């Protein structure tokens, strides 16, 4: 089916209990990337587009420090406008915060 025809998850059974971190990105930042990113990728799907990922930015920065929301979203813009994956995602904001 191309279109949505209604009823995809009527009991959310919402399991945010799963992986507990060994040498790898703690509890702050296992919440803040997959719940932000599942958000906008709800039923599985791979990319997420600049206006969900502004969204995104505007929940996941709060308060930072210079050139790191703005910078995302500038420099994934770009050949092919902005699209980005959760490699880039977990890599690129992971990396410039810790």
């Known amino acids: 089916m191309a279109s949505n025809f209604k009823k ?24 803040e990337i997959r719940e932000a990113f599942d958000l906008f990728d709800a039923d599985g799907t791979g990319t997420i587009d600049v206006k969900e990922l502004k969204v995104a930015m505007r929940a996941l920065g709060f308060e930072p420090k210079k050139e790191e929301i703005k910078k995302m979203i500038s420099e994934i813009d770009k050949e092919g406008t902005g699209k980005m994956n959760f490699g880039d995602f977990l890599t690129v904001m992971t990396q410039k915060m810790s």
């Open 8 to 31: 995809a998850n009527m009991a959310s059974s919402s399991q945010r209990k799963r992986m507990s971190p060994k040498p790898e990105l703690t509890e702050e930042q296992k919440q």
